[PDB]
Design an enzyme around this catalytic site. Structure first.
Site, PDB file in Angstrom:
ATOM      1  N   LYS D  41       0.995  -1.151   0.051  1.00  0.00           N
ATOM      2  CA  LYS D  41       0.168  -0.191   0.019  1.00  0.00           C
ATOM      3  C   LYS D  41       0.795   1.352   0.064  1.00  0.00           C
ATOM      4  O   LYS D  41       0.327   2.445  -0.463  1.00  0.00           O
ATOM      5  CB  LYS D  41      -0.994  -0.046   1.045  1.00  0.00           C
ATOM      6  CG  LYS D  41      -1.900  -1.406   1.139  1.00  0.00           C
ATOM      7  CD  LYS D  41      -3.217  -1.185   0.407  1.00  0.00           C
ATOM      8  CE  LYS D  41      -3.762  -2.329   0.255  1.00  0.00           C
ATOM      9  NZ  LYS D  41      -3.526  -3.410  -0.673  1.00  0.00           N
ATOM     10  N   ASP D 118     -11.469  -2.475  -1.548  1.00  0.00           N
ATOM     11  CA  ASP D 118     -11.642  -0.965  -0.650  1.00  0.00           C
ATOM     12  C   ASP D 118     -11.885   0.379  -1.543  1.00  0.00           C
ATOM     13  O   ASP D 118     -10.961   1.100  -1.505  1.00  0.00           O
ATOM     14  CB  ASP D 118     -10.682  -0.910   0.448  1.00  0.00           C
ATOM     15  CG  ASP D 118      -9.949  -2.225   1.153  1.00  0.00           C
ATOM     16  OD1 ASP D 118     -10.813  -2.930   1.327  1.00  0.00           O
ATOM     17  OD2 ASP D 118      -8.829  -2.423   1.061  1.00  0.00           O
TER      18      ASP D 118
END
Lengths: 302, 120, 120, 304
Positions: D41, D118
């Protein structure tokens, strides 16, 4: 006037890396701080394996590290902790100690510190005979190395009873400190963490108490922002609990900060603000020093 | 007669087995851990056999502490430095949990943790 | 009409002020932190119109903690972020749970955490 | 049959450095695992700033990493998450993605992943006109990119409804998954995390259920040892709650483990013990307690 104000890397955990230490020097310079105490607990050769010698790889690193201390106008102090397995009496021990400090002097270091922090109070039978009390053993080897190195300007000493709680029976009546204060050379400086290990407050009265017994003003090893004992808690608070009234009554303040290097901005920035506020023997507001530091820190995030 | 040289006990398999029980899985505690927890829950629910189990729990605590030490003295700093926070932390909670037991047989964590406690 | 671009808001002085107050000193909480702790304890003690406003101000303040986390995580300086990330991430989580709790009042931490719950 | 088994570095937090990543590949090899999905990420250029290209310095780093992966017989799969600010209908966007994935091939990469985890389900006006549903928008660009690159062997896709508790109204009745199963190209693999994001168990029943609606066998993104959601917790437990019976019913298992690199010994070790326990298996063979003692015995040799 010579006041040693800066940072002590004397924590249990992952030590700081070359470029971090370099950045610390850039910072201490910019904030008019002047000292750096090299005591990382990871370093086997500073503590556990003090007798051992730095390799060529190790030697080059420390040189490069000391070269940056000079480059940024920071005083580098090399600390050594031998009180674990040292045989105070035996001269080969004292000889190896001298050999190590020699190697360190080869790297470009002139200022030293001998730490007898967190070590067994009882002596072995060989040392027990030769020295009156445990204090006499420490003071003997300290004075010896101090003079051996040509009585250096900066030579620190960390007593075993380095704080108020550790004193037997109490600070004013401790025969340990009484021995050090009477027998340790005046050119040598003594380290103090205050009433406690992590002192909430360091009252002026308490510093006069200990100063009278050590027969000198101490150098504060400050554990206020220390977080090795709870790496589940971070301290971004301002240096607080130390009156500016302490500055003329002290030889210096070396802060032992958080393990996480980047998380130490506000600690060091606020120490500098505290120091500069009464450099010369209410001037400081922790709450105000914090806003000062956060305003400066904010720039780094971009 | 002189002061003995510095030596450190190595990390043992029994330590790793304890370590993995303390830091097990998201939905399950390790046998050793789930156990220690039951024993502390039990000794607290009692106030005066108790001392027979308490002596064993204090040894169990001692094992966690012994384990931390050996792990911290080990050659591989890299493995330890990656877990120091977790390992150091359990050793600290055990030390005081042990001390609390000795007090019963003789008659921290920050802000997030405080909000944690203020909830069911 | 096209999907709007992603443009991260930068860390504010107010975020750092909140951050320093949430992670203060060994024996003291930061003004804001202590205030948020006093506010939660009061809101929990009740179930007047003064509650619907105090719960609004508190949930807004929990918002700010999430806000601060969001902004810290998108900043250019990765180095500073990662040295703190754990601590900051944890308080944001606990704060998110606490925010939902005070909404509902108007209608974790592993093994070390567990032992710490059973101590006075 | 081909099976993807390894690690997905896909967590929130301080990413693994090079020496660590090289070491992982060495471990994956020794243990006879074959894949590494790159989805950290922190790589802004993989997620939030998917449009931006790797600088010279960065490009070098990736090449060495991709090379090391081939040097230890590990398949490197590059992941890209564009679902944040992408306009699916705008071809300038589709050209940017092609342009981005190309630079990555030139580093040595032959395997790819398009993630839609997400992200915002509600599309923009442009996309609401061109695409009858969000599910249609993703499948379009995924299929498109799969053919552009030259129908690669290893092409993975992560849906928005990637776990049981994310499907609307349920797995079997999902209009989203229905569109994915029906329209997504055959050669493209689908990532699934089981009943929940961090599944306690991943029952066979649920794997049969999801396989029907996606009309293929999934590749599991396991969050069993993930600790980014509570870094006051570390997971040293053995791989547990996944039947050895799942192996003949899956196209792979890629474990997303603790942020702290060195603490993943048991996690990757027990996962290998598990995979190898029913490798050749067609359609008990694995004990977590035994798998642990094996891992702990092997790990101990690394401490001295």
């Amino acid at each position: 006037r010579r006041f040693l104000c800066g940072v002590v890397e004397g924590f249990y955990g992952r030590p700081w890396v070359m470029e971090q230490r370099k950045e610390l020097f850039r910072r201490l310079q910019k904030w008019e701080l002047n000292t750096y105490l090299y005591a990382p607990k990871d370093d086997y050769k500073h503590r556990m394996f003090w007798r051992e010698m730095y390799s060529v790889e190790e030697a080059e690193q420390l040189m490069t590290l000391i070269s940056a201390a000079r480059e940024y106008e920071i005083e580098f102090i090399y600390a050594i902790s031998p009180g674990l397995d040292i045989t105070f009496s035996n001269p080969k021990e004292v000889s190896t100690l001298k050999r190590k400090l020699d190697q360190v002097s080869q790297f470009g270091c002139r200022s030293f510190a001998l730490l007898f922090d967190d070590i067994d109070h009882n002596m072995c039978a060989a040392d027990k005979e030769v020295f009156s009390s445990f204090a006499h053993a420490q003071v003997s080897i300290t004075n010896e190395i101090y003079q051996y190195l040509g009585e250096p300007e900066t030579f620190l000493f960390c007593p075993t009873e380095y704080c108020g709680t550790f004193c037997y029976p109490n600070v004013s009546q401790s025969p340990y400190l009484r021995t050090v204060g009477e027998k340790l050379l005046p050119g040598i400086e003594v380290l103090w963490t205050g009433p406690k290990v992590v002192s909430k407050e360091i009252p002026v009265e308490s510093i006069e108490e200990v100063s009278k017994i050590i027969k000198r003003a101490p150098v504060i090893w400050d554990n206020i922002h220390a977080n090795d004992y709870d790496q589940k808690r971070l301290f971004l608070g301002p240096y607080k609990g130390r009156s500016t009234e302490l500055i003329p009554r002290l030889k210096g303040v070396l802060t032992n900060p958080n393990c996480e290097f980047e998380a130490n901005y506000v600690a060091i920035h606020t120490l500098a603000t505290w120091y500069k506020s009464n450099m010369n023997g209410v001037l400081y507001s922790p709450q105000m020093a914090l806003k000062l530091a956060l305003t400066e820190w904010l720039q780094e995030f971009g | 007669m002189e002061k003995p040289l510095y030596t450190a006990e190595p990390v043992t398999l029994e330590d790793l087995q304890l370590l993995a029980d303390l830091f097990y899985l998201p939905y399950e505690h390790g046998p050793k851990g789930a156990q220690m927890l039951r024993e502390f829950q039990w000794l607290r629910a009692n106030s005066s056999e108790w001392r027979s189990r308490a002596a064993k729990f204090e040894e169990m605590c001692g094992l966690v502490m012994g384990m931390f030490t050996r792990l911290s003295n080990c050659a591989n700093r890299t493995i330890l430095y990656d877990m120091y926070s977790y390992v150091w932390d359990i050793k600290s909670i055990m030390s005081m949990v042990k001390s609390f037991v000795q007090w019963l047989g003789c008659r921290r964590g920050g802000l997030a943790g405080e909000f944690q406690r203020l909830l069911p």
